[PDB]
């Protein structure tokens, strides 16, 4: 079992884990998993945390022949609606040899007491396309069995994990409201049809 990445300040404040972590540039993929998880030598230069905000900086020397850095970027906010401190990973950033690229992660969210997990966080549609891009990109990312927590951590273990979209989805709900509505009409129609009758007699 791979040990998580952990960011520590007196105690662990951010915990991050995956079954795979991989990236591409110019669509050429590389595997970072064994270069990242359980690597005590992993460079975390510029990693930072606050109760409102988290920046898990990950740094690597050989990728695409150069030094490469990632920021996984998160916030905690109280919402009066629910009256909880929710959290989200709103975005990722890639800092290159001389430029920056980013992904509008969005769906990674939950209450701050729970970690989040997903089978895939990726740009690819076969893997859900959670890494939303408003511009064309030479970069790509995929996390497999992604799991994260960045607030209310306790010990070198996650708290309980909220799923991404396990039991229902938007298209499913809209589909069902339509389907159940037309199935109600079908029942009404069919009830009248099953109520059809014929005579047992005729006039003289």
């Amino acid at each position: 079992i791979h040990p998580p990445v952990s960011y520590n300040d007196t105690a662990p404040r951010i915990l991050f884990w995956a079954q795979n972590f991989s990236v591409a540039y110019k669509d050429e993929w590389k595997d970072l998993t064994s270069l990242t998880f359980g690597v005590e030598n992993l460079n975390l230069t510029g990693s930072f945390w606050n109760d409102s905000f988290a920046m898990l900086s990950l740094t690597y020397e050989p990728l695409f022949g150069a030094t490469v850095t990632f920021k996984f970027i998160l916030a905690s906010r109280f919402y009066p609606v629910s009256a909880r401190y929710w959290f989200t990973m709103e975005r990722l950033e890639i800092h290159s040899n001389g430029s920056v690229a980013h992904f509008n992660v969005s769906q990674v969210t939950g209450p701050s007491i729970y970690s989040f997990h997903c089978e895939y966080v990726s740009s690819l549609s076969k893997k859900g396309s959670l890494l939303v891009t408003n511009v064309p990109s030479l970069w790509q990312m995929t996390l497999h069995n992604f799991q994260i927590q960045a607030f209310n951590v306790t010990g070198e273990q996650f708290s309980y994990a909220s799923d991404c979209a396990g039991f229902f989805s938007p298209g499913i709900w809209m589909g069902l409201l339509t389907t159940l509505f037309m199935l109600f009409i079908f029942t009404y129609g069919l009830h009248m049809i099953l109520s059809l009758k014929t005579m047992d007699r005729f006039d003289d």
Binding site: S82, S162, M174, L177, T178, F181, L194
Partner: protein, 203 residues
């Protein structure tokens, strides 16, 4: 009996299962899920709207259709011994169709309002578009169901009037007043649906 019991079973089972789920996600602390917020937000406002428009027509048409045959059946059945009924008592059908008219009026008015957002993020969609989709659903539902009930009532009372005429012609003119009190309910449905519609804009 049996075909109702099969449906009743599904109906009770549905609510029983919701009670089980409601307890389950509460007691397991998973009650942060199924927050009505995401359901009422990730659903497209156009879905709510178009259901609204289609309800406004179709429920009015159902109310009117029941309206029609309920009185018509009596017009015909009394008409065998009292052929005079048909020409005058047909005004009940006209009021049942007026309930359908109230439908098509409100539906066409609602149908002018919707336009594309060019957006998919709830914040880029913004409050006006959600409020419109809901208000349009509400309006179309309001007129639709109000008319549904209105038309059935008009059909019922108009049948009564037709069978009164079959015994004495003078009864029709007197009794006919109740068809107004029926029809007014459909107009009230329209009035509310206009007001629910009155602030909407989309895109």
């Amino acid at each position: 009996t049996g075909l109702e019991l099969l449906y009743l079973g599904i109906f009770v089972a549905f609510w029983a299962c919701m009670i089980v789920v409601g307890i389950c996600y509460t007691i397991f602390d998973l009650g942060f899920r199924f927050d009505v917020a995401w359901f009422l937000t990730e659903t497209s406002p156009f879905m709510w709207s178009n259901l609204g428009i289609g309800l406004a027509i179709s429920l009015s048409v159902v109310g009117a259709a029941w309206g029609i045959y309920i009185t018509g059946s009596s017009i015909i059945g009394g008409g065998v011994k009292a052929p005079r009924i048909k020409t005058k008592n047909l005004v009940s059908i006209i009021f049942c169709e007026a309930v359908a008219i109230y439908g098509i009026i409100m539906a066409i008015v609602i149908s002018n309002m919707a336009e594309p957002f060019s957006a998919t993020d709830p914040k880029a969609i913004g409050h006006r578009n959600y409020h419109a989709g809901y208000s349009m659903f509400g309006a179309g539902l309001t007129v639709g169901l109000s008319n549904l009930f209105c038309g059935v009532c008009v059909g019922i009372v108009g049948s009564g009037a037709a069978l009164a005429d079959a015994q004495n012609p003078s009864l029709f003119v007197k009794i006919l007043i109740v068809e107004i009190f029926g029809s007014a309910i459909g107009l009230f449905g329209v009035i509310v649906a206009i007001l629910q519609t009155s602030r909407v804009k989309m895109g």
